[PDB]
Amino acid sequence: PRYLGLMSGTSLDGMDIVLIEQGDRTTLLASHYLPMPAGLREDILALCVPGPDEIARAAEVEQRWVALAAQGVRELLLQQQMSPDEVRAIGSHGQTIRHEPARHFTVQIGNPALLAELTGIDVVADFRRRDVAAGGQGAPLVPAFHQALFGDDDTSRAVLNIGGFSNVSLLSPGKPVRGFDCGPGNVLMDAWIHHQRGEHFDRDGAWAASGQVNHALLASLLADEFFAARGPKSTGRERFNLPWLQEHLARHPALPAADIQATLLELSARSISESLLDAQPDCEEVLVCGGGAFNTALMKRLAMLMPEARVASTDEYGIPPAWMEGMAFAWLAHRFLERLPGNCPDVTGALGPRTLGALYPA
Amino acid sequence: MPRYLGLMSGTSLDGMDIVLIEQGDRTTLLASHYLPMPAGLREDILALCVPGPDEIARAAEVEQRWVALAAQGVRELLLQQQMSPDEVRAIGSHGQTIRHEPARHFTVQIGNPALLAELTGIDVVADFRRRDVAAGGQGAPLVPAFHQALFGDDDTSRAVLNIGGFSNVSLLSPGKPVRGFDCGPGNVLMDAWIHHQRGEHFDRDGAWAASGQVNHALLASLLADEFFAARGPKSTGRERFNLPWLQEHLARHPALPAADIQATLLELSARSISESLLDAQPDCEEVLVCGGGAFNTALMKRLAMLMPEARVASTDEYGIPPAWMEGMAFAWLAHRFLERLPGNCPDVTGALGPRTLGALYPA
Ligand SMILES: Nc1ncnc2c1ncn2[C@@H]1O[C@H](COP(=O)(O)OP(=O)(O)NP(=O)(O)O)[C@@H](O)[C@H]1O
Ligand SMILES: Nc1ncnc2c1ncn2[C@@H]1O[C@H](COP(=O)(O)OP(=O)(O)NP(=O)(O)O)[C@@H](O)[C@H]1O
Ligand SMILES: CC(=O)N[C@H]1[C@@H]2OC[C@@H](O2)[C@@H](O)[C@@H]1O[C@H](C)C(=O)O
Ligand SMILES: CC(=O)N[C@H]1[C@@H]2OC[C@@H](O2)[C@@H](O)[C@@H]1O[C@H](C)C(=O)O
């Protein structure tokens, strides 16, 4: 059977649409990227902070989100010369607008009934909430998929997503899959360069690379309680955001903006490397996915901070780093429909294995 | 002959209805259980029915408590019936409407079905309205398909009329597609007015209304609302009919006695039902009344007088308790989802066509 996966992550760069075949293997068949319209991007970011009239605002924003998703699905199908009927189901994450696992809730918008109506394909959606209901963080969910791809008897591996947020899957032989969110990935580097220069992101980490790390600031940032925590943990824009950074910056006289950028890159690399090696000290291979894999400067620093391990993108292993998250949700649709568990209890802290998501039939 | 639970909490927020049916060749009400709505939860839910601050966080927390209460209701029914959760195929859960905006193409029912599934250990089918809305429909009312299944009769033009917080009718005309719509306020304003004035949750038997005098001028002004003039598919809710709405009209006429305003509100519900029902189904022979309005003696008497051509009676007279019809309908829709039989009526909702309604959250 073939499955579509739809992901729109933290970074709000665009929508990912993937087509896989699931048999004994998971094979990527096709992909399609649609950049996020600037208006829709702003309207989603506006829902990530508490504000007024959120029920109505969210209901309208998610109509536009779903329409874009359905358009992307249509475009992939046309490109591949396939009918919808050839696809078993779409696995749709939706869009996170609030993540408060401490308060036992997570909010992904993306009106699945409307996605089913527009695409003519069954939709499996709302994957995180059964994990949270069972006492879990609800995140990260990719570890079960990372296992399916890269679980190796002889090799101690970390599979590292660097999206807006970073998260790692620890694949240790003869051990439960573990993992967690490491902290910020691209989110603060993207925020800072956009705040300062109106750029979307820091191309190849060049701006960061042109600056010097500021020790006082780095120490300030790394002392956030999130970094000290071990075991299951998940985060989001609730914690790591421009106001948070500004608060730290206020405690010292002004710095060059590129030094701040440089420190933000070091924050990402340090929080990742230290949480990864704290959990899996005998790691021999770090398999990097997400768009952070294209930040040359970041990838260099990760290799330096983890000299024991080979740091490489998943491309080496036949999986494009950009499409890993899309692939995961396609996979999760399959897991739903076969009634196999989608969470990893030692990742999320949930009471046990759970079937994740909900079916909206065409 | 599988068994389904139905879980419903309507706009009146009086409480939570849990039903158990068997769905063989026909629908059989096996059991029911009623939970009063805790006062704090009722207020928290109402607070979400009007635009306000921090709604995403407030709704997420409120629904935790709604689901916990629903789950305890399910447990209590199963304990009373000496049943295991494994004996139930699925729960059909409407959730709780907090916003209904058909003209903006959205409707919002809270009630975290994944948590409901976790807590009950029973498969949940929820989120019934949004596929109909997706297909261009009102999303409401959804009972007509169930009403047709229960009471469809090729000999008799019947109307099945729910009088809850809001009123809605199912028009079962022999040889014709099922039609229907919300009629207007049911109990919502009579409840709101007596609570506003005296702190009562409802006007028992419509005795307070009956003591007052209908104000014909005020009545005409209320019935002049554009909603009442619309025909075909239409749906409404607290967004339209609420205390501010009444008060804008009250600031037309002099300082009326509160009992006269209550009498007027009763007549408003009676006239809006009678006028819309008769307009759509002049041939109506029987009006079968369900929902809590069936228990308002004064209202039922007025409906009878305003529709002298039809036999007006509660569904009790036809072997379904008026109180439990809605819960039964959602249990039935869980069934329809599983069998992939359509849940909507396009000539009711205005949708493009028949649709499978709801979403499955497996235990
Ligand atoms: N050439 C590059 N140099 C530096 N950073 C890059 C480059 N290309 C992409 N990025 C970063 O990667 C980010 C987007 O990665 P992505 O993995 O799509 O994030 P996401 O949206 O949070 N996750 P997803 O759901 O997988 O799309 C951008 O915002 C940039 O910060
Ligand atoms: N004895 C009675 N006399 C008068 N009114 C009554 C009586 N018993 C119940 N009611 C009314 O019935 C209402 C509740 O009916 P119910 O059928 O539970 O509505 P609901 O389902 O919550 N609303 P909705 O979702 O709009 O259909 C109460 O708020 C009262 O107004
Ligand atoms: C609540 C939420 O949307 N978390 C995202 C986010 O983006 C990265 C990281 O934080 C991860 O934990 C999760 O996404 C990926 C797809 C996951 O669940 O594995
Ligand atoms: C949006 C919404 O929840 N509408 C309710 C309300 O309560 C009565 C009436 O207005 C009806 O249209 C509907 O409920 C019943 C259960 C229905 O869908 O038939």
Same domain, yes or no: B191 and B126: no
Greatest distance between any 2 Cα atoms in chain A: 61
Q: How many other CB atoms are there within 10 angstroms of residue A39's CB atom?
A: 9
What single-letter amino acid sits at B242?
A: N
Candidates A47, A117, A132; nearest CB to B134: A117
The three-state DSSP-derived secondary structure of chain B is: CCEEEEEECCCCCCEEEEEEEEECCCEEEEEEEEEECCHHHHHHHHHCCCCCECHHHHHHHHHHHHHHHHHHHHHHHHHHCCCCHHHCCEEEECCEEEEEEHHHCEEEEECCHHHHHHHHCCCEEECCCHHHHHCCCCCCCCCHHHHHHHHCCCCCCEEEEEECCEEEEEEECCCCCCEEEEEEECCHHHHHHHHHHHCCCCCHHHHHHHHCCCCHHHHHHHHCCHHHHCCCCCCCCCCCCCHHHHHHHHCCCCCCCHHHHHHHHHHHHHHHHHHHHHHHCCCCCEEEEECHHHHCHHHHHHHHHHCCCCEEEEHHHHCCCHHHHHHHHHHHHHHHHHHCCCCCCHHHHCCCCCCCCCEEECC
What single-letter amino acid sits at B250?
A: L
Candidates A55, A125, A336; nearest CB to B55: A55
Ramachandran quadrant class, B13 (left: phi over 0; alpha: psi -120 to 50; beta: rest): left
* Burial call B121-149: b when 16+ CB within 10 Å, e when fewer: ebbbbbbbbbbbbbbebbbbbbbbbbbbe
Same domain, yes or no: B27 and B17: yes
Q: Which chain A residues in 91-120 lie under 8 Å from chain B, judged by CB atoms?
A: 97-98, 100, 103-105, 107, 111-114, 116-118
Q: Which listed ligand is nearest to A17 at the C-alpha?
A: 1
The three-state DSSP-derived secondary structure of A184-252 is: ECCHHHHHHHHHHHCCCCCHHHHHHHCCCCCHHHHHHHHCCHHHHCCCCCCCCCCCCCHHHHHHHHHCC
B189 Cβ under 8 Å from any chain A Cβ: no
What single-letter amino acid sits at B260?
A: D
B54 Cβ under 8 Å from any chain A Cβ: yes
Q: Residue A188 contacts by C-beta under 8 Å, 6 or more apart in sequence?
A: A240, A241, A242, A245, A264, A267, A268
Cα dihedral sign for B256, B259, B260, B262?
positive
Q: How far apart (Å, rounded) are the C-alpha atoms in residues A164 and A325?
A: 12
Cα dihedral sign for B87, B90, B94, B95?
positive
Minimal Cα distance from A97: which residue of B? B56
Resolution, expressed in angstroms to one decimal: 1.7
Cα dihedral sign for B142, B143, B144, B146?
positive
- B115 with B82: CB under 8 angstroms? no
Same domain, yes or no: A286 and A209: yes
- B120 with B74: CB under 8 angstroms? yes
Structure tokens at A156: 């101690």
Q: How far apart (Å, rounded) are the C-alpha atoms in residues A131 and A106?
A: 10
Q: How far apart (Å, rounded) are the C-alpha atoms in residues A107 and A128?
A: 9
Q: How far apart (Å, rounded) are the C-alpha atoms in residues B31 and B14?
A: 20
Among candidates A110, A131, A354, A341, which has minimal Cα distance to A234?
A131
Give me ligand 3 centre to Cα A98, in Å: 12
Ligand 1 proximity of A329 Cβ (cutoff 6 Å)? no
Structure tokens at A120: 């003519």
SS3 of residue A103 by DSSP: helix
Q: How far apart (Å, rounded) are the C-alpha atoms in residues B133 and B122?
A: 27
SS3 of residue A261 by DSSP: helix
State the angle between helix axes of B243-250 and B258-280 in degrees (0 to 180), rounded to the nearest 10: 110
Q: How many other CB atoms are there within 10 angstroms of residue A304's CB atom?
A: 11
Indicate the number of domains in chain B. 2
Q: Residue A142 contacts by C-beta under 8 Å, 6 or more apart in sequence?
A: A159, A161, A167, A169, A324, A325, A328
Residue holding tokens 């022999």? B174
Give me ligand 2 centre to Cα B184, in Å: 14
Q: Residue A244 contacts by C-beta under 8 Å, 6 or more apart in sequence?
A: none
Q: How far apart (Å, rounded) are the C-alpha atoms in residues B285 and B158?
A: 6
Cα dihedral sign for A358, A362, B2, B5?
positive
Candidates B106, B134, B356; nearest CB to A59: B106
**Contact between A130 and B118 using a beta-carbon 8 Å cutoff:** yes
- Whats the size of chain A, residue-wise? 362
Q: Which listed ligand is nearest to B193 at the C-alpha?
A: 2
Same domain, yes or no: A98 and A199: no
Q: How far apart (Å, rounded) are the C-alpha atoms in residues B7 and B128?
A: 12
Give me ligand 1 centre to Cα A337, in Å: 30
Residue A207 main-chain phi, psi, to 5 deg: -65, -50
Same domain, yes or no: B318 and B236: yes
Same domain, yes or no: A232 and A133: no
Residue B268 main-chain phi, psi, to 5 deg: -60, -45
Q: Residue B281 contacts by C-beta under 8 Å, 6 or more apart in sequence?
A: B157, B159, B171, B173, B179
Instruction: DSSP letter for A37, please.
Output: P
Among candidates B167, B165, B18, which has minimal Cα distance to B97?
B165
Q: How far apart (Å, rounded) are the C-alpha atoms in residues A126 and A90?
A: 12
Instruction: DSSP letter for A46, please.
Output: T
Same domain, yes or no: A179 and A317: yes
Among candidates B192, B207, B215, B214, which has minimal Cα distance to B296?
B207
Distance of CA A241 to the CA centre of its chain: 16
Cα distances (Å, whole numbers) of residue B32 to B28, B133, B146: 12, 30, 18
Q: Could you tell me the CATH number of the domain that includes residue A154?
A: 3.30.420.40
SS3 of residue A115 by DSSP: helix
* Burial call B331-353: b when 16+ CB within 10 Å, e when fewer: bbbbbbbbeeebbbbbbbbbbee
Minimal Cα distance from A118: which residue of B? B134
Per DSSP, what are the bridge partners of residue B224?
none
Q: How far apart (Å, rounded) are the C-alpha atoms in residues B100 and B129?
A: 10
SS3 of residue A82 by DSSP: coil
Same domain, yes or no: A221 and A313: yes
Per DSSP, what are the bridge partners of residue A286?
A158, A311
Structure tokens at B144: 């007509």
Q: How far apart (Å, rounded) are the C-alpha atoms in residues A281 and A265?
A: 22
- B48 with B98: CB under 8 angstroms? yes
Same domain, yes or no: A106 and A180: no
Q: How far apart (Å, rounded) are the C-alpha atoms in residues A336 and A330?
A: 10
**H or E stretch covering A172:** none
Q: Residue A326 contacts by C-beta under 8 Å, 6 or more apart in sequence?
A: A5, A6, A7, A16, A17, A18, A31
Size of interface A-B (CB pairs under 8 A): 114
State the angle between helix axes of B113-120 and B55-80 in degrees (0 to 180), rounded to the nearest 10: 30
Same domain, yes or no: B80 and B194: no
Ramachandran quadrant class, A142 (left: phi over 0; alpha: psi -120 to 50; beta: rest): alpha
- B332 with B20: CB under 8 angstroms? no
**H or E stretch covering A286:** strand A285-289
Same domain, yes or no: A119 and A92: yes
State the angle between helix axes of A257-279 and A215-222 in degrees (0 to 180), rounded to the nearest 10: 40
Boundaries of domain holding A267:
143-321
Collect contacts of A152-155 with beta carbons under 8 A, ≥24 apart: A155/A284, A155/A285
Structure tokens at A238: 């609730």
Same domain, yes or no: A44 and A184: no
**Angle at alpha carbon of residue A213, lines to A210 and A214, rounded to 5°:** 135
